[PDB]
Design a protein around this ligand. Sequence first.
Ligand SMILES: O=C1c2c(O)c(=O)ccn2N([C@H]2c3ccccc3SCc3c2ccc(F)c3F)[C@@H]2COCCN12
Ligand SMILES: O=C1c2c(O)c(=O)ccn2N([C@H]2c3ccccc3SCc3c2ccc(F)c3F)[C@@H]2COCCN12
Ligand SMILES: [Mn+2]
Ligand SMILES: [Mn+2]
Length: 177
Amino acid sequence: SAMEDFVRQCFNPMIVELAEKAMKEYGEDPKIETNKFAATCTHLEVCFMYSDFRFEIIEGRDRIMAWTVVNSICNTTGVEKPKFLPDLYDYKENRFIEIGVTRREVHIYYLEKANKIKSEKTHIHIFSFTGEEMATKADYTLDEESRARIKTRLFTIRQEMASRSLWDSFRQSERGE
Ligand SMILES: O=C1c2c(O)c(=O)ccn2N([C@H]2c3ccccc3SCc3c2ccc(F)c3F)[C@@H]2COCCN12
Ligand SMILES: O=C1c2c(O)c(=O)ccn2N([C@H]2c3ccccc3SCc3c2ccc(F)c3F)[C@@H]2COCCN12
Ligand SMILES: [Mn+2]
Ligand SMILES: [Mn+2]
């Protein structure tokens, strides 16, 4: 697959390894669901970048470790345990964060995410590949420079896919029919 080749050339080996592990843990084959493989790598990279600017990283851990970290936070802050695994915890605002990366309009994916979690407590932050974002209460958490770095990386991934004639397939596989 050209998409598997792109993933393994354009993503940090650590990202690729963790995304492969996450897909295996969740019974999906990176070699068949190749766009999903690219999506999980992209989202992981965004989560790491976000956390790197205050934050505990939940994403990128095996499931048992992720819930272990979540439980430890809830025990030491009294924040309520989320029903679904979030991506980060914010020690400044004392709230979990769900990060979404979408090839669709940010408002659509935001509504989908917010409908899934139904827990107002978890903060939602959505990024598109063209510099758009939508966040709970229009509170973007990060400053403008950090969000800019994230947006630039996402756009770069999109243009790399476009250079390789991969973007259209990737864009159409996010939502089913
Ligand atoms: O943590 C996530 C997750 C998100 O954080 C997310 O934003 C969107 C989607 N997620 N999920 C995605 C995921 C993450 C990033 C990009 C696409 C996908 S698509 C389905 C899938 C995920 C992970 C492994 C796998 F094999 C999958 F099929 C699963 C949902 O259940 C808990 C873990 N997780
Ligand atoms: O900036 C960082 C970075 C730190 O600033 C840091 O404190 C710890 C770790 N970092 N790094 C990690 C990183 C940061 C946060 C959470 C997980 C990861 S894991 C691999 C990875 C990083 C960044 C982007 C990326 F695509 C990666 F695959 C890399 C080291 O050098 C260059 C940029 N960078
Ligand atoms: Mn996640
Ligand atoms: Mn997420």
